Amino acid sequence: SKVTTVVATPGQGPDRPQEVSYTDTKVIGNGSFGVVYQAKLCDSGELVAIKKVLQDKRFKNRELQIMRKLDHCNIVRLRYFFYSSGEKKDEVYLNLVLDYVPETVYRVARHYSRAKQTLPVIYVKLYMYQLFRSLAYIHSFGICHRDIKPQNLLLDPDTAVLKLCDFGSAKQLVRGEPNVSYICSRYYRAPELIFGATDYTSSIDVWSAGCVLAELLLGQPIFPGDSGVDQLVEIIKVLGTPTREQIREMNPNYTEFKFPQIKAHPWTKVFRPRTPPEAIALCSRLLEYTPTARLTPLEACAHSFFDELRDPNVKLPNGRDTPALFNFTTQELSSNPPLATILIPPHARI
Amino acid sequence: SKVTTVVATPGQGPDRPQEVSYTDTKVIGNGSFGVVYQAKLCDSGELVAIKKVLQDKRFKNRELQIMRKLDHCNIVRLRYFFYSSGEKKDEVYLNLVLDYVPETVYRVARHYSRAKQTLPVIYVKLYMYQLFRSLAYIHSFGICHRDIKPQNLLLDPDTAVLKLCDFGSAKQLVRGEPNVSYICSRYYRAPELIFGATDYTSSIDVWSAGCVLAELLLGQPIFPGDSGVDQLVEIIKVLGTPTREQIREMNPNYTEFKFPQIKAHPWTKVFRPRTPPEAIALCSRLLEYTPTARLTPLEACAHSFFDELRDPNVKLPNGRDTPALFNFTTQELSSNPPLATILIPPHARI
Numbered sequence: 251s252k253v254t255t256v257v258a259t260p261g262q263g264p265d266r267p268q269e270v271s272y273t274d275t276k277v278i279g280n281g282s283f284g285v286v287y288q289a290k291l292c293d294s295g296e297l298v299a300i301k302k303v304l305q306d307k308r309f310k311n312r313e314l315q316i317m318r319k320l321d322h323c324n325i326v327r328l329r330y331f332f333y334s335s336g337e338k339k340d341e342v343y344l345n346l347v348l349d350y351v352p353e354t355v356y357r358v359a360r361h362y363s364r365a366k367q368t369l370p371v372i373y374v375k376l377y378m379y380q381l382f383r384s385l386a387y388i389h390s391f392g393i394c395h396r397d398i399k400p401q402n403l404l405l406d407p408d409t410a411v412l413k414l415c416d417f418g419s420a421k422q423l424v425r426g427e428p429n430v431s432y433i434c435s436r437y438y439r440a441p442e443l444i445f446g447a448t449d450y451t452s453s454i455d456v457w458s459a460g461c462v463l464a465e466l467l468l469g470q471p472i473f474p475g476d477s478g479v480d481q482l483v484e485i486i487k488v489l490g491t492p493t494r495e496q497i498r499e500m501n502p503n504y505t506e507f508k509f510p511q512i513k514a515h516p517w518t519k520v521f522r523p524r525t526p527p528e529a530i531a532l533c534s535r536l537l538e539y540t541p542t543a544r545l546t547p548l549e550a551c552a553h554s555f556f557d558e559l560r561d562p563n564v565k566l567p568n569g570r571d572t573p574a575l576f577n578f579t580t581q582e583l584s585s586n587p588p589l590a591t592i593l594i595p596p597h598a599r600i
Numbered sequence: 601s602k603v604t605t606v607v608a609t610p611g612q613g614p615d616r617p618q619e620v621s622y623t624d625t626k627v628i629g630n631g632s633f634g635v636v637y638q639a640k641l642c643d644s645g646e647l648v649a650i651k652k653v654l655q656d657k658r659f660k661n662r663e664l665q666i667m668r669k670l671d672h673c674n675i676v677r678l679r680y681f682f683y684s685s686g687e688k689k690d691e692v693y694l695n696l697v698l699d700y701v702p703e704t705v706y707r708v709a710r711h712y713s714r715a716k717q718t719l720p721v722i723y724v725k726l727y728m729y730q731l732f733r734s735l736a737y738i739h740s741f742g743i744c745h746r747d748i749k750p751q752n753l754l755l756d757p758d759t760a761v762l763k764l765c766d767f768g769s770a771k772q773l774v775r776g777e778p779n780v781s782y783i784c785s786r787y788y789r790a791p792e793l794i795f796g797a798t799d800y801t802s803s804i805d806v807w808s809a810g811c812v813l814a815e816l817l818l819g820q821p822i823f824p825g826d827s828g829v830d831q832l833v834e835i836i837k838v839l840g841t842p843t844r845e846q847i848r849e850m851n852p853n854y855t856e857f858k859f860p861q862i863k864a865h866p867w868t869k870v871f872r873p874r875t876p877p878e879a880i881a882l883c884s885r886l887l888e889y890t891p892t893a894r895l896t897p898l899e900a901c902a903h904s905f906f907d908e909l910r911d912p913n914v915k916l917p918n919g920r921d922t923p924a925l926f927n928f929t930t931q932e933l934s935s936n937p938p939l940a941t942i943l944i945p946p947h948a949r950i
């Protein structure tokens with residue numbers, strides 16, 4: 251087959267470019283970002299994804315700057331990066347060589363939905379725990395993903411490994427600095443964002459993760475609607491009408507605007523009867539109006555819902571062992587070090 | 601079949617309730633609002649739509665108050681309204697008995713898209729002109745629809761009549777008064793809305809109409825994306841980067857965040873080669889960053905693109921005559937009475 255050779259800089263470590271050869275290049279994604287390709291490394295035979303985006307030279311690429319700083323088992327690793335041409339003549343493309351993860355939470359959730367089945371609760375715990383670990387990690391550097399949604403959550407169906415992807419909307423949130431409210435995808439946007447808040451925190455990713463949990467439990471999005479108004483109506487139908495205080499906590503420019511006085515709906519009636527109570531309690535705690543009232547990713551990891559993952563007898567339905575779940579770093583635990591008493595179970599490999 | 605009898609108040613004219621009997625009640629829509637039913641009037645045999653919404657009781661329904669004031673050939677008529685119940689006790693339901701229009705621009709656009717065809721240009725002129733007439737009308741009372749999109753544009757395929765529907769998001773915009781920016785559906789939202797502006801005018805409906813025109817010409821949305829950021833990237837790719845003046849016109853809290861410096865793309869390269877130049881010129885003039893730079897609905901009606909509609913020999917493909925197009929009222933022309941020199945052609949003056 252056609253072999254492409256490039257002089258790529260490694261993602262982590264010293265800036266020491268290497269000749270990287272790859273083959274079997276197929277397009278696997280096309281979006282607002284640019285193009286995502288799948289390719290096989292000639293050396294290892296290992297599969298990779300290459301994200302190709304047009305570079306301005308006007309500034310450094312924000313995604314690359316973020317990607318270069320990260321190393322987590324639940325985040326798609328930046329292996330290399332290089333520059334090229336490809337669609338535009340006289341223009342530069344930045345190419346991010348990333349880990350390849352075969353499936354998306356989006357496609358898997360769709361399979362079950364179509365077959366009128368729900369994703370087994372063991373997978374809901376595995377996928378959600380791993381998402382919270384990735385969130386604890388990025389948040390520990392002050393980095394907010396800002397686009398948490400099923401399409402950005404990659405899975406290995408055989409290993410049960412989830413890896414967060416898309417660092418295109420990612421930004422380091424500094425207190426007092428204003429940020430664009432128009433980030434985040436429909437169904438997954440926190441109420442502060444819908445209200446156009448520019449003072450939001452990393453707790454927007456927690457709201458999004460909570461929407462993803464509720465969707466895997468329901469078999470459909472919890473807060474649908476093609477407009478902010480429709481989305482808010484669906485939120486109010488579950489959470490009840492936000493208080494004047496709760497409105498202030500999100501955006502204080504929307505306090506004088508009248509809302510439909512809906513009763514605070516019991517979260518147990520939202521989900522099917524068989525739904526575990528700890529799953530319901532987790533949603534309740536993530537999907538909160540007051541951004542500060544939401545659990546943190548590290549606290550979410552330590553929630554009762556994930557206890558089965560900490561059981562020494564836990565196994566994957568295919569017989570295999572669970573992937574890495576307890577290899578926490580000092581950085582990863584930094585937000586609340588005592589949580590490691592819950593997080594690292596006695597049996598955890600050492 | 602099951603016959604339902606109600607004492608309904610007529611939508612327009614004096615408050616003189618009447619016994620309205622209807623049968624063959626089927627659900628035709630389910631959304632954030634409530635339910636839309638189709639029903640047959642026992643009297644005439646005439647088909648109607650009944651919109652059932654849960655009433656707040658604390659205050660009058662804004663959609664009902666808006667509907668009661670309107671009478672236009674390009675707007676779904678409120679025939680009657682009555683109160684009832686459905687879920688279950690204490691809960692009052694407002695029922696709007698409306699004209700039934702058999703198709704949606706959404707479904708029709710979808711048929712052509714699926715068949716790799718485009719809606720014939722004669723229909724693009726007929727449907728778009730009629731939308732602008734409905735917009736000229738509501739705007740003349742200071743009323744902004746705020747949710748212009750293909751799903752809210754109803755059609756009679758035999759008569760080529762378009763009728764605007766959904767007055768759920770409609771509001772009378774008063775200068776100096778702030779309005780929610782979270783109205784309007786993805787793909788159809790004006791840049792001021794994406795930027796969280798609360799000071800927007802009725803020209804948001806013009807942007808939406810312009811998105812609908814470009815979509816009927818392209819065979820797909822002009823500015824897709826599941827996030828405001830993705831939508832804005834698509835807008836910038838066509839319109840070029842907005843100036844700091846243009847950013848100020850939309851939202852002056854976003855004049856500080858800098859954007860990807862993309863050249864002002866020629867609108868001719870956006871559409872297929874066959875696309876009439878006046879259609880391209882119309883999108884160009886509707887899809888403008890500066891809200892004040894956009895054509896008004898009445899000016900849009902008077903645009904070169906619609907000249908074939910003013911031809912005395914114009915006929916529908918089935919042989920029939922074009923629906924009413926020139927019966928302008930003083931109210932309808934109020935924004936710019938001299939435009940009637942272009943709008944009312946000589947053959948309509950006889």
Ligand SMILES: CN1CCN(S(=O)(=O)c2ccc(-c3cnc(N)c(C(=O)Nc4cnccc4CN4CCCC4)c3)cc2)CC1
Nearest residue numbers: 278279283286299326348349350351352353354401415416
């Ligand atoms: C042969 N098949 C395998 C299965 N798919 S799939 O649609 O399930 C799919 C598509 C892409 C990936 C993928 C694998 N590894 C990655 N590192 C990325 C990735 O980084 N994607 C990405 C980058 N930037 C922004 C967004 C994304 C999200 N993806 C874009 C394509 C779909 C998800 C994406 C995985 C499965 C298509 C091709």
Ligand SMILES: CN1CCN(S(=O)(=O)c2ccc(-c3cnc(N)c(C(=O)Nc4cnccc4CN4CCCC4)c3)cc2)CC1
Nearest residue numbers: 628629636649676698699700701702703704707751765766
């Ligand atoms: C047998 N088929 C006929 C064609 N359809 S359809 O989906 O094309 C359809 C659905 C509804 C209408 C319809 C006909 N007349 C109306 N007056 C309204 C209406 O008022 N709809 C409405 C009310 N409030 C908010 C939004 C809407 C928008 N519609 C609701 C369904 C989608 C369009 C809706 C027309 C065609 C379904 C049943």
